[PDB]
């Protein structure tokens, strides 16, 4: 076949041909180097405080943002079943506190549907962004 890569299109040859001609830009302009850092992903947010303290910070943040929640029982103290105002108008969330290490806890956030296989998490993601920011300020 006669399918090829045009050699003069490759950066190394193009640069060299511009340098050989004499144009100053050849020395001064450098190629774009996009350093793509390996992003570390985590579920939810970590806290170094202790259970009752953490749960207290969350509820305070929830209250100031205008959310409502169900009364928890003794078997599910570390679970928040909340509703947020933001066609169904009220978004449901489940927030769960987990223990990692002795001094380390993870706050898990879960979308739980709407109240009046194919769905958008973006309204959920937007609200959690507000919640994480509200929490970061109070700290």
């Amino acid at each position: 076949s006669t399918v090829s890569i045009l050699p003069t299109s490759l950066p190394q040859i193009h640069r060299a041909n511009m340098l050989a001609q004499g144009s100053p830009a050849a020395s001064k302009i450098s190629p774009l180097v996009t350093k793509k850092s390996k992003t570390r992903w985590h579920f939810g947010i970590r806290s170094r405080s202790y259970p009752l303290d953490v749960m207290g910070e969350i509820y305070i943040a929830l209250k100031n943002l205008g959310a409502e929640w169900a009364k928890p029982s003794e078997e599910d103290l570390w679970t928040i079943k909340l509703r947020w105002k933001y066609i169904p108008d009220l978004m449901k969330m489940v927030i769960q506190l987990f223990q990692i290490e002795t001094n380390n806890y993870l706050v898990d956030f879960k979308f739980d549907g709407w109240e009046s296989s194919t769905f958008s998490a973006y309204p959920f993601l937007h609200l959690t962004t507000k919640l994480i920011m509200e929490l970061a300020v109070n700290s």
């Binding site: 006669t2 399918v3 299109s9 709407w114």
Partner: protein
């Protein structure tokens, strides 16, 4: 005797490709698990550029957190608009620097460019229908959009590209081998009114050719018509990254030094090449077009992905 056989095998391969396209949905093109990068509209333009470059993508759906709805696709066209606006208003550097994605429509109004009624397809629909719609996109990207089963809101599932369709075809239809008719005998190459420039042409003029001609790239030739390089809409992303205020009156040749070292190159072919070979290249590498050259390397035409799709769908 021999040209009769080549012809009927080509016909069989094409009928087979078309049936495949008629039997598959856009949903089928999707990987079993994949990522969808969406930008809030209040995000800065220059940060959105970094998000694209960091993630090795060239488009991203937009999300309006105020109205809780999708606000279209950020593409290289939006970035062309910004550079054109700045070049015409170099006093407004501060506005451009602090420009947010939702401010793009103000830039559009200031330049007088059309709204652009960007298409969409329901994933459940035949792939063949998404192909027909692809012949209208100049971006080469169309959002896959469904309905949220609870909010009834219109929502983005993915972004379909022409490359991805043609690669999906190539991977699943090895009958491409029997496309042995030289592309020169098919009348699928565009040869008339070739928009081109030279190495000394200022990059801003080349950028004007992209939107004024409705083309994704501009071939770069010497005085005698030899193909040397190309300037792509994609290159604009690196051009803004490396200083807009800096490269006001820079030549295309000079601007091309900003290209990353991982640039994969410009593909060329001749009139004697076959679509079997073309699809093989698409199968194995991201190729967006094949520039047709003669026996000595002079530019005679271009065969883009849209030309190949159009042949698959509509014929010669």
């Amino acid at each position: 005797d021999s040209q009769e056989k080549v012809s009927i095998e080509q016909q069989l391969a094409v009928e087979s490709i078309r049936k495949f396209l008629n039997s598959k949905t856009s949903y089928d093109v999707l990987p079993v698990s994949y990522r969808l990068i969406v930008l809030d509209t209040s995000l800065l333009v220059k940060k959105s550029l970094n998000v694209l470059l960091q993630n090795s993508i060239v488009s991203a759906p937009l999300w309006d957190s105020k109205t809780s709805r999708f606000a279209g696709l950020l593409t290289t066209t939006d970035f062309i608009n910004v550079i054109q606006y700045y070049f015409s208003n170099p006093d407004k550097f501060e506005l451009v620097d602090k420009l947010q994605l939702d401010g793009l429509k103000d830039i559009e109004r200031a330049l007088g460019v059309d709204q652009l009624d960007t298409a969409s397809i329901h994933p459940s629909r035949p792939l063949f229908e998404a192909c027909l719609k692809m012949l209208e996109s100049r971006s080469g990207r169309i959002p896959l959009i469904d309905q949220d089963e609870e909010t009834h809101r219109e929502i983005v599932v993915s972004v379909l590209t022409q490359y991805r369709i043609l690669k999906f075809v190539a991977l699943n239809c090895r009958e491409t081998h029997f496309l042995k008719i030289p592309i020169g005998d098919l009348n699928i190459i565009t040869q008339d009114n070739m928009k081109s420039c030279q190495m000394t042409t200022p990059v801003i003029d080349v950028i004007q050719m992209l939107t004024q001609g409705r083309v994704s790239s501009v071939p770069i030739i010497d005085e005698n018509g030899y193909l040397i390089n190309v300037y792509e809409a994609y290159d604009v992303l690196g051009l803004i990254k490396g200083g807009i205020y800096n490269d006001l009156s820079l030549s295309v040749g000079e601007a091309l030094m900003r290209r990353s070292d991982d640039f994969e190159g410009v593909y060329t072919c001749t009139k004697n090449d076959k679509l079997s070979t073309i699809m093989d290249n698409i199968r194995k590498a991201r190729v967006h077009r094949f520039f047709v050259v003669d026996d000595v390397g002079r530019l005679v035409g271009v065969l883009t992905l849209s030309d190949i799709l159009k042949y698959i769908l509509l014929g010669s």
